[PDB]
Amino acid sequence: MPIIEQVRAREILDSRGNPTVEVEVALIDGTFARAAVPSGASTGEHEAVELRDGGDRYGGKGVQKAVQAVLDEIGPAVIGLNADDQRLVDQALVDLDGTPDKSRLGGNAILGVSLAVAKAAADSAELPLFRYVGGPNAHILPVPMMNILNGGAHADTAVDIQEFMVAPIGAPSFVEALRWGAEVYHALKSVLKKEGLSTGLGDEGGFAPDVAGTTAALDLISRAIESAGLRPGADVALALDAAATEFFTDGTGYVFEGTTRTADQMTEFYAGLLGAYPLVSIEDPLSEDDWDGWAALTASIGDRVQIVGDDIFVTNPERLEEGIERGVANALLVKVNQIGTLTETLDAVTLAHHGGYRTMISHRSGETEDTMIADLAVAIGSGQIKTGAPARSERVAKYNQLLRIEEALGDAARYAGDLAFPR
Amino acid sequence: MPIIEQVRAREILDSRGNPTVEVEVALIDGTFARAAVPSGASTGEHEAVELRDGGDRYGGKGVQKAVQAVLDEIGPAVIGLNADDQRLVDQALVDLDGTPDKSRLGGNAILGVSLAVAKAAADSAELPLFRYVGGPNAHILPVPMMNILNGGAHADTAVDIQEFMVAPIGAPSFVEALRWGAEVYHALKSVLKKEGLSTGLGDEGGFAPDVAGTTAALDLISRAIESAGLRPGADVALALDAAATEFFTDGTGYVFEGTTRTADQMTEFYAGLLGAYPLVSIEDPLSEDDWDGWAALTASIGDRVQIVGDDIFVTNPERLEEGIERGVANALLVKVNQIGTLTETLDAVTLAHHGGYRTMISHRSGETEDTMIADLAVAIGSGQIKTGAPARSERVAKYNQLLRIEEALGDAARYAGDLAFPR
Amino acid sequence: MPIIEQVRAREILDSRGNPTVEVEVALIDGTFARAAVPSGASTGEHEAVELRDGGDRYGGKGVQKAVQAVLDEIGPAVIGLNADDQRLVDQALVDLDGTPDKSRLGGNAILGVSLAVAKAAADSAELPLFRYVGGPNAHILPVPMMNILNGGAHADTAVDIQEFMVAPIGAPSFVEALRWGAEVYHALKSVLKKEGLSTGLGDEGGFAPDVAGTTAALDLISRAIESAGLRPGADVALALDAAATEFFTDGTGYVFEGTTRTADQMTEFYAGLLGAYPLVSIEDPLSEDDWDGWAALTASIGDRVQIVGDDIFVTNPERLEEGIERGVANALLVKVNQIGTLTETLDAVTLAHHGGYRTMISHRSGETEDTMIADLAVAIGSGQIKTGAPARSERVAKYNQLLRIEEALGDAARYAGDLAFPR
Amino acid sequence: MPIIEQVRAREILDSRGNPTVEVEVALIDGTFARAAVPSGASTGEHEAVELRDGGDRYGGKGVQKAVQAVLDEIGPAVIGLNADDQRLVDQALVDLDGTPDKSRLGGNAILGVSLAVAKAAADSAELPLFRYVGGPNAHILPVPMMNILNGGAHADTAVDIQEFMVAPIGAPSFVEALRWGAEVYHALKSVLKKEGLSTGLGDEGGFAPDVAGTTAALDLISRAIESAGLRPGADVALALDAAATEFFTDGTGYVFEGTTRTADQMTEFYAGLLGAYPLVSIEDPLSEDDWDGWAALTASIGDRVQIVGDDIFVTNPERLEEGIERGVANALLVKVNQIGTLTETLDAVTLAHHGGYRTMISHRSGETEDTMIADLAVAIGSGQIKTGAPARSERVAKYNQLLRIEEALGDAARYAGDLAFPR
Ligand SMILES: O=C(O)[C@@H](CO)OP(=O)(O)O
Ligand SMILES: O=C(O)[C@@H](CO)OP(=O)(O)O
Ligand SMILES: O=C(O)[C@@H](CO)OP(=O)(O)O
Ligand SMILES: O=C(O)[C@@H](CO)OP(=O)(O)O
Ligand SMILES: [Mg+2]
Ligand SMILES: [Mg+2]
Ligand SMILES: [Mg+2]
Ligand SMILES: [Mg+2]
């Protein structure tokens, strides 16, 4: 019986050395499972609340309140539930909290429990996590969207764009795709060295040189792709995370590469890049509440490129539904800790998929050794994952787990390849 | 270990007294599971091949060849595979057969095995079938599309339209929805008696009166809805299965209610009905290869009503993809035995869902006591199922299994209600 | 230990879309079993009470009272009993109810429990149900008495006789017998089509044409038998269920084919049919309390044909004993829900068998996907079963279960054949 | 899995010190069971063959041939069969032997195996033997027909009648019935002492005085009944086993109480006794092949008394069927070792019960400590058992086992009482 018997939590550190929540769930059948919670830097205003202790300890970033919420409220509320009833458990967590934003117990407390319960349920059913969540049909290895040059909120440089990504769409397999990503990454290191630019890493393992702007970064990456003996576009395409909320002034506009710009001028800039570069995807080109901006931008270039809502949707079925109704974006970034339960995450994924939107499972910039999102990408057959440069094991551990899933699937595996980006 | 140890098959009878295939799978861990195969009357030209014995026995409709294919080829080919590797098993079946149409072993032999393996895998994982196939998030109880007045290939009357369906979209729950369907069905019996019309049943448990045509049938059903104290549209909407391939002459047109008509004239007829009746769905309004007809029809009325491809798509990812590319239909009828594996079925469902098409899990007109499709509707969260009148237990057994699933989900259950048909 | 741990019930639908009772029993050893209750249309006055809710819901036919009786009284009364002590459990049910007719808890509540306990006991002993109930000697596959033309209370026609049955007595095996029944059924469809008569089905899956009377129906069936290449009598004999209580006026006589007739005139009619047709069995030729009628009828023709008490005996040892003492009938129709426990059913079967009466296990006209009666026919070695046309899976599922039993018995199986009807 | 793994046999002694067969069966699940074979003195000509060694050893009565047949032929022929498939095992035994009379392996070899397999099957199903053989409905405790004054082939006296029996039909329970039998037995000892007659026991534990004839014996027994404070007839009735084949001369007649008599004169004698004594049953009043004698006798007195075929039927469905067809007897003596399998025994019981004949489970005059027939009487609900005086533990061990069965049934037990003998 996968009946929940114990729920414990502790404070651990994330990939940036900030505290975060880890939860352990034990079932009466002796199943034991552990899940850890990530933490963003460029956090949307509408994200589920991350409960922090404040005061002096860890610069105010302790999570002993979220840990005590798990031990003293959540544990007692879910012991005796069936770990297999994910939705019942998730509803109990949401009702226990009783706020819209999970501001009482914390999204970080609640998600830890949601995720450890799923894992315990999968363990108890003796199914790999991808197969428990995704069923027997879960088989698609995602294109790894690899952020190999970091800026914005992920480094201490003047680069406005947060993430410069390569996408090995042309690879025959995930195992080859990963190798292509690693070879381009190592080539970019050599390119940056030759140019006298920093190979110091940002938060997501990408090089964090202080380059002059967007096109300089994209030129350096295209050189790195060629220098690894791959063709930009056909083998390795480009993608961005502008995280434009980070450079947007409320009711004002976008302070971008030395000027304040309108949504339409930003759209002009992005349309220029499409013309000049093999870009398959642009995430948060405009700010989280710039609904008119996004609608025009999606009208203008959405037929030509994937447009990914992150801070605009925060993995929230209510915000996604508003986007679908308004013709805003054509893809959803899927972050479990933007919404705070697996159930709500899977409702948002269901709403995207049924609305003809693509899905891209995402890390946060503050990650752990947890590889859950590797299993989650295969489960939902997104065919797209965003989990870092092939550097720093909070990123690599997810790619290593995709290797193991691909290996376990055998002839059943399919690499999403260029079928991830029809445009 | 859910390793397949034995695969046996036998000849059973379907709901019309014709032979069909039943398969039993036993796993080394003592798991034992049984699945039966349905059989259509209005079968699309492009359906996976149903292997029949021919000769005198059962009027040529024996399935002893399909049974011997299971015992002598398939069993030996899949014993020692993991029942959890649904895709590997399904690929082995497809490679063993080695034809495009499953014409060597039979779609009926292959599907029996595909379905019994899924069931054994679910049993071994100690998960209800809906949850094994659908994962922990499977929770949506479908609107029952109930075919309560049967014509075309399902009765011996002059009625051209195959299926006249009621859809209790306004019900708060599946258990109430089912009751509304049953109350309307019993009301329609009384209406038909008062009118001196036959209450003899057709193949799908609907009354098979010889009514004058389409609008007469729809008037009789609207009276039955009112007479059960429900509002046509808001509580109980209408749906059709024209099965127009059955009255279509190759390269000629549609012999419909006493005249040969063009695709555009049929479109005119359907548009008229929309004007006059609370119709939410029309299946196969035009023939299986009338690609231009369907494109125009979907252009003309697809914003206003669900348009369901059955014989045009035959649950076939290659035919569905062609439809999506051409703007043909906005929904897929999902029949496991049109394509012959669970894997291929789930690929077609994935392709529809990712293309923004709706999905409706379907019975065949020749059914068994098997309730697999009840679990399959909840698993894929179609929110729509088509499994007969609430009469004849080959139909009712599926509705009884949806009751049990709803009960097992508890507060987690959601009834798809009017959220099944946004138009 | 097959100790009863839980007893739950729910409302499901029968083959006519009316509510009925389903019961689940769980034993401390993890055994879990489910049984559903049938419901008659032509119900004898002396049948155990079927508890109905009344009011608006399901036209007054809800069974939420019977479900609550299971959950709130019966469950608490039998938890901790051994499921193997069938008689103790059945006595507890009968004492808990405390009425002669089971009018307090309902025959439908009580039987659900009686049947689910037997099934749980059989599961726990790891014996097929036929072998648990019948012991190791249970091996006789019954002649399927197949009601392929429905009238009386089972259709909306002017045909007085309820059931027109074919009996493949000449078949070498149950599997061949079933095929003969199906081939005759499909032949009768073609015969009816040629004659311009309805192939709309009645409640038991038989064609429900409005034929002129008894001999017309029997002529149509004899043609169907010949047209399937079988000999009427030697291969396929005929049988009837007059259900004469349905056309009997208290203290008056029998309104039959356009005239009021005496018991003796009805006897004359039946004796005529014997002369003209290969009839092996006639059920309820006279009304449920017409004791003198039956005695004379059994005197007159009982040496020449099987005479089956249904409404006269209602599977009731007290009514059967009265019949045996008076020389009334020579066979008992065995309906579990006429009496309301398995124990009482088996007492009536024991009383018939010890009195030299034959036994015929029967469905009701309102059936479920439950196949218990298939196992019950083999268990008691009746050699006769009445479970419908080989159409509608509430009938076919029983024939499919007889196939599986025959297969499991191997060389041990015997088909009752013509040894079912010595006269 | 109740798969037969080992079959061993040994030579033991019966209640007379003659060798007989004991068989042990072990199943792969660790089930182990033992059964022993009885041996008659007044053996019918048509009995299954009892294999004896001949020569000097045990006066020619060794069974080392039957033991070696078990070890060397039967064991190898049934290892790997399911012990639950009683009929398959019994058919394998009968086919292995391959003779009509079981003259190759011996009825004693074959029955030992048949009986040990049933017991192992019951043990493996964790069901008491009565319940495994009889199903959940087995509940009737038989009237003990107690042979308390022995003559004919069971003692060395001039008394022609083999068995003088008392039947406590008036007792409320088996436990009281047994006490009544024991009290009458002890009273008869005192009566015989007062009369100067022998209290030396015969083979079946009855006193074996050399009394003048039939009426003297019956007078002595009626005195013993009164002297125990019971009423002859209403409390304790009388029964006989004439075993008339023992005093019949082929084609000649019956040498009985000092004269040769015809069947009709014997019938006259028996009719006289009915007039004078509370007799409920007479077994083998005439010889095993005197078919005309029996038919007349059954015509003459069969309405007034139970008439039991023993040597005429030898538990043989073919001989019983001949009797039923000729109106010979109205009851079958059931001796497993007259026919040599449990299956054939149960076919004969089925044939009697379906023919309206009563059934009386019987010991042989050479018994063992085996109590199988106690369980067999309850299983088949005969309501009559014949297993000796309540003296000599080869008889008492069966009565002790009926006590335990009655105790285990609790409120479910019914004592057959006077409902055993309707006449
Ligand atoms: O990308 C960003 O705008 C922020 C918010 O989505 O998150 P992270 O620091 O995890 O990238
Ligand atoms: O609906 C129809 O055209 C046919 C083909 O899809 O099938 P069935 O007889 O099962 O309805
Ligand atoms: O046959 C009939 O008279 C009735 C009563 O026995 O029952 P049913 O509707 O189940 O046939
Ligand atoms: O009663 C008898 O005639 C013989 C034969 O049936 O047997 P037993 O010695 O066992 O009584
Ligand atoms: Mg972002
Ligand atoms: Mg269709
Ligand atoms: Mg009847
Ligand atoms: Mg005898």
Residue numbers in the entry:
A (entry chain A), B (entry chain A), C (entry chain A), D (entry chain A): 1 to 423
Authors' account:
Enolase, a ubiquitous enzyme, catalyzes the reversible conversion of 2-phospho­glycerate (2PG) to phospho­enolpyruvate (PEP) in the glycolytic pathway of organisms of all three domains of life. MtEno has a topology similar to other enolase structures, a smaller N-terminal domain and a larger C-terminal domain.
We speculate that, by switching to this alternate conformation, 2PG facilitates its dissociation from the active site by weakening the loop 1 interaction (Ser42) with 2PG on its formation from PEP. Taken together, our study suggests that 2PG-canonical switches to 2PG-alternate in order to dissociate and exit from the active site during reverse catalysis.
